[PDB]
Structure 1
Amino acid sequence: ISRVYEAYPEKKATLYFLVLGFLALIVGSLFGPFQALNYGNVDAYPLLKRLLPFVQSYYQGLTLHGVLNAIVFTQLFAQAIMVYLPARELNMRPNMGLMWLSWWMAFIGLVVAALPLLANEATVLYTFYPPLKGHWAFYLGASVFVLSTWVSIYIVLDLWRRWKAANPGKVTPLVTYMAVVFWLMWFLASLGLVLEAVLFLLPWSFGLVEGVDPLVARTLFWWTGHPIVYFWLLPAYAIIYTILPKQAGGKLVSDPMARLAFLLFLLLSTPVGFHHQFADPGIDPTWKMIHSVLTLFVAVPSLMTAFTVAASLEFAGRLRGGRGLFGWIRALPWDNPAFVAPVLGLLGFIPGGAGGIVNASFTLDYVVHNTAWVPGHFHLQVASLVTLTAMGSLYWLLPNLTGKPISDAQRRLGLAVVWLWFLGMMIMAVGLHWAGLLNVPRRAYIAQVPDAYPHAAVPMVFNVLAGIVLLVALLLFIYGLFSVLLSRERKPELAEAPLPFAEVISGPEDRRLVLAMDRIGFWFAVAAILVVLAYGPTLVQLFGHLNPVPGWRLW
């Protein structure tokens, strides 16, 4: 009933990803506030048990919070953004058969895994560390869910190959380049989890075998486990580099800087996982040091980015009548939530980064490992930057997909949602980083032992405050998203509008630089040798000495 669906059927496919994505975010995020209070030393759970009778414990909540938000929402967002954007930029159509196959895989795979989670048969958390054994349908569900991305990789490789064929010797366009090294990086990354799942988790929960080696299980897990946060980040980065400078009234100030950033992510994203295993036995301390260094290097892409985006925002700001050293901050369009959401997120990303760089320094980890600090670190990262970017992007992407415009009432509701979400996330971060310096362990129902951590007196106040602020924010967001998704207001012409892609200042020195980076086949091979060099030596030694242990259910 939409022609706009008929020359851009890729629009509809993209909408379904986003819709499924934001739904997961809502269901997941409900447990957020309850968990913030938990860390405020307030026990809200009998209340939530009454609303949601199916919730059996704090830990099922957390499993649902982790999985729907960090695995489901983020992967669905990525798939929408890192397929659609490279499609609109090349002005080509994604192989539509495959695209819809990946949506159903993701949809069926979610539903298959939703059941055991909702039936409390897989209260194992989103890391699912063996021997804690979850229902087989959870493992199969996720497998297929994650395998959906393999169809996306293909679709976007296709799109790229087809643009290559039609333009022999031209330099891959930026967004496409980003999407291309994006999905290749993810492919290299995804082998870890896929191997864990095919070698251990699936046979195990099918009963074919009785034991699983915890050390290899989690070593392979963190193979995929780190690049997957970059698999979360980069779709937001793609948007910030190539859509935000325009929403800010300026230009992306450097094409090849943006290319270099994404290139380095393909390069250093995967061979660093041991930074999650600093506290593990049976992994040589040298290999840890190596990986600690490769992890500081992986920080460089985000340091570069920090300047590039700032330059563009200041450029945007000056064009807007940016006064002196800070005048350009006031010159930006603080009235547009599509701009506000990501920039605020970038602020929260500053404490976010320092925490991560701390965490990465091998020996410094022991201070914070598994404490409330780590949740501190990553809510500034995924639940702030990524989420806020995504929410903000509702303001332009959603019009372009559906042809529904945005009212002033809604555009203002968004600004409220966005500022609250930001303020709520900041407040919490201080609570959790604080609490984490005081040894409060993460993944704990601490309200159920009210006297255990009295020294976290004041941070607990913050954690409480954040829970209230963020619950409001969440409710307002549900309100505003549904108000946009439930109006019948349709202008099919704003649906046929171009995406607000931003133009790029180009220089002379670009060419030779950019050319060298478009050597994708070579850089991918280098990417892969690194993984083999980083993981190989250890993986072989762990595989030489397999010590499978029986599974357990303790919920």
Structure 2
Amino acid sequence: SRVYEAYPEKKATLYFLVLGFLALIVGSLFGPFQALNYGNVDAYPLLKRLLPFVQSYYQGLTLHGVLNAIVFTQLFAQAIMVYLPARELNMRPNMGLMWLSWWMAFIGLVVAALPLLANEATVLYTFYPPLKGHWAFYLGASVFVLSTWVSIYIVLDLWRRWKAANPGKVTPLVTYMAVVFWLMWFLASLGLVLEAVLFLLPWSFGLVEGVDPLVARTLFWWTGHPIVYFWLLPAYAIIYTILPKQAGGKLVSDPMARLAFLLFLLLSTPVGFHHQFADPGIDPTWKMIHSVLTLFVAVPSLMTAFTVAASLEFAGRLRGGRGLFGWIRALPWDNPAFVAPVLGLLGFIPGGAGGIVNASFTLDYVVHNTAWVPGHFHLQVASLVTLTAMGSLYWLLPNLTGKPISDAQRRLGLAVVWLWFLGMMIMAVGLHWAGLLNVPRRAYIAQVPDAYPHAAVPMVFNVLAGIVLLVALLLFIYGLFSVLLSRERKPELAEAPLPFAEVISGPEDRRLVLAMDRIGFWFAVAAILVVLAYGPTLVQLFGHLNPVPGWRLW
């Protein structure tokens, strides 16, 4: 087509997107079987017939975590947070670099995947030493992640070129979001990169004998918190700058949207000890400081809740809805593009509430390493982030391919989205409630059927969620491939503009925007906070290293 000659960035974006959804599908296959497990039903003998390379529950669990939480979410982030700013500025990104990023991602995936498939790295997506995976797993994971440094370069390049042509102008809203997003990720990424380079790689190749597990976990959770905000912020970008148009209204505030993203730049990285409240050898004072900073990282989503609800109420009133609740009925509940993230946002209320409990230092001892935790995070990433990505089939995919969505495909989409959402809610009840009964996460509980009798009722919810989400996944697969493999094309769809929302403006807004646009300053503040929050403890740990030998227990 001549459309990809003018807009080659459409084709690269599509490749990120498709690869990402294939990952989501393969990783999600294991979910229903894990849910049935948490219902005391053992369906793994059947799964091994279908997929004979699967040797255990925990190998299935590794694939699930890696493919869904690391691979799908990264590739979605890379697609959304490069292509959207490019389209807002109407400038082409460096296509050499953009293709280089895709090939790094694809090669790292293939390399990591092989030991995963051969039962050589059954260590879960957190890969905590001294459990020792195959070298290809760590090498592949490292190359996959480093792919993002090239994306960071590509957006900073776009931003700089725009500033050179538009001196004295404030950064446009979507591009401001992406620049602070990618700068945050650079700082965030250093924990894992350092862990891999100084420790996991030399160790897996045989160059050093052991690894200190405490320093490894500490470096991991430097990256391991801000990675979940890395997963979230692409959906937020869509929820702020695209969803309001789809609802029939406007974004009620540019500055409040900018402020939320800015707070994420500052507060997403210096908080990882909230994953280490139960670790020895880290001072309680530091745990409290990180606990306090974790409660502050809640503020931008508290802020987000009001700004987005007010935007949707505004759209609802424009479409003629009256009273307390009539604005809701007037929203376009027949469009899957609107419905999917909104359901996502509803489930994010209990999801966020659980997060705040988890952050509260001593309250974490009630719920740490129980089923509660997967209950929390499926509401966040497996519902809101994933559902937002699913809705983008219905506006983004035609914009990239020229393939229209039929009315039947629309209707199917509405079913998939509702069943997925309802499935996650049912599971959330079962896992939260089981967690309070002391049922552990990361456990093949079905193989010890008499061990948790007190949890018989929440287990029924887990079985049910298991089968509901099986049906939703099957319908999704069918729906995705109906759109992709469809014969009909319409190039006028690929040349149309993206449905960016308009903004309501106030005299206040320009003074605020200028202060927020001093991105060099704000980046420097975020770097210093990481150094203060992490430096003193790392100096102490590197001073007293105690490396220990590796083990293979699978």
Q: 1: CA distance between counterparts of 2:110 and 2:152? A: 22
Q: 1: CA distance between counterparts of 2:162 and 2:37? A: 52
**Local SS of the residue matching 2:332:** coil
**Local SS of the residue matching 1:171:** coil
Q: 1: CA distance between counterparts of 2:55 and 2:505? A: 57
Q: CA deviation at 1:175?
A: 0.2
Q: 2: CA distance between counterparts of 1:533 and 1:320? A: 50
List per-residue Cα deviations over 1:510-538 (Å, max 9, x = no partner). Answer: 10111000000000000000000000010
List per-residue Cα deviations over 1:232-262 (Å, max 9, x = no partner). Answer: 0000000000000011000000000000000
**Local SS of the residue matching 1:161:** helix
**Local SS of the residue matching 1:23:** helix
**Local SS of the residue matching 1:162:** helix
**Local SS of the residue matching 2:177:** helix
Structure 2 residues without counterparts, runs of 5 or longer: none
Q: 1: CA distance between counterparts of 2:351 and 2:168? A: 40
Q: 2: CA distance between counterparts of 1:206 and 1:261? A: 43
Q: 2: CA distance between counterparts of 1:554 and 1:321? A: 63
List per-residue Cα deviations over 1:373-424 (Å, max 9, x = no partner). Answer: 0000000000000000000111100010000000010000000000000000
User: Residue 84 in 1 paired to residue 83 in 2?
Assistant: yes
Residues matched between the structures, number: 554
Partner in structure 1 of residue 394 of structure 2: 395
Q: CA deviation at 1:48?
A: 0.4
List per-residue Cα deviations over 1:91-126 (Å, max 9, x = no partner). Answer: 111100000000000000000000000001000000
**Local SS of the residue matching 1:495:** helix
Q: CA deviation at 1:178?
A: 0.2
Q: 2: CA distance between counterparts of 1:464 and 1:331? A: 35
Partner in structure 1 of residue 41 of structure 2: 42
Q: CA deviation at 1:169?
A: 1.2
Q: CA deviation at 1:542?
A: 0.5
Q: 2: CA distance between counterparts of 1:203 and 1:316? A: 56
List per-residue Cα deviations over 1:452-476 (Å, max 9, x = no partner). Answer: 0011111000000000000000000
Q: CA deviation at 1:73?
A: 0.1
List per-residue Cα deviations over 1:457-511 (Å, max 9, x = no partner). Answer: 1100000000000000000000000000110110011110100010111111110
Q: CA deviation at 1:184?
A: 0.2
Q: 2: CA distance between counterparts of 1:415 and 1:271? A: 39
User: Residue 446 in 1 paired to residue 442 in 2?
Assistant: no
Q: 2: CA distance between counterparts of 1:480 and 1:341? A: 15
Q: 2: CA distance between counterparts of 1:17 and 1:443? A: 30
Q: 2: CA distance between counterparts of 1:539 and 1:512? A: 40
Q: 2: CA distance between counterparts of 1:353 and 1:304? A: 13
Q: CA deviation at 1:7?
A: 1.1
Q: 2: CA distance between counterparts of 1:91 and 1:274? A: 41
Q: 2: CA distance between counterparts of 1:94 and 1:364? A: 47
Q: CA deviation at 1:76?
A: 0.1
Q: CA deviation at 1:553?
A: 0.6
Question: Would you identify which runs of 4 or more consecutive aligned residues in structure 1 move more than 6 Å?
Answer: none
Partner in structure 2 of residue 138 of structure 1: 137
Percent identity of the aligned residues? 100
Partner in structure 2 of residue 30 of structure 1: 29
Q: 2: CA distance between counterparts of 1:387 and 1:191? A: 26
Q: CA deviation at 1:272?
A: 0.3
Q: How does 1:259-270 map to 2 (within 5 A)?
A: 259-270=258-269
Q: Compute the TM-score of the two structures, normalised by the length of structure 2.
A: 1.00
Q: 2: CA distance between counterparts of 1:4 and 1:203? A: 47
**Local SS of the residue matching 2:18:** helix
Q: CA deviation at 1:163?
A: 0.6
Q: CA deviation at 1:372?
A: 0.2
Q: 2: CA distance between counterparts of 1:321 and 1:553? A: 64
Partner in structure 2 of residue 189 of structure 1: 188
Q: 2: CA distance between counterparts of 1:140 and 1:41? A: 36
**Local SS of the residue matching 1:349:** helix
Q: CA deviation at 1:4?
A: 1.1
Partner in structure 1 of residue 351 of structure 2: 352
Q: Compute the TM-score of the two structures, normalised by the length of structure 1.
A: 1.00
Q: CA deviation at 1:205?
A: 0.5
List per-residue Cα deviations over 1:62-91 (Å, max 9, x = no partner). Answer: 000000000000000000000000100001
Q: 2: CA distance between counterparts of 1:322 and 1:63? A: 47
**Local SS of the residue matching 2:231:** helix
Q: 2: CA distance between counterparts of 1:4 and 1:313? A: 34
List per-residue Cα deviations over 1:116-163 (Å, max 9, x = no partner). Answer: 000010000000000000000000000000000000000000000111
Q: 1: CA distance between counterparts of 2:453 and 2:369? A: 19
User: Residue 299 in 1 paired to residue 298 in 2?
Assistant: yes
Q: CA deviation at 1:323?
A: 1.1
Q: 2: CA distance between counterparts of 1:431 and 1:271? A: 32
The CA RMSD over aligned residues, in Å, is 0.4
**Local SS of the residue matching 2:492:** coil
Q: 2: CA distance between counterparts of 1:428 and 1:185? A: 32
Q: 1: CA distance between counterparts of 2:19 and 2:289? A: 40
Q: 1: CA distance between counterparts of 2:505 and 2:128? A: 48
Partner in structure 1 of residue 51 of structure 2: 52
Q: CA deviation at 1:3?
A: 1.3
Q: 2: CA distance between counterparts of 1:324 and 1:403? A: 41
Q: CA deviation at 1:322?
A: 1.5
Q: 1: CA distance between counterparts of 2:550 and 2:247? A: 53
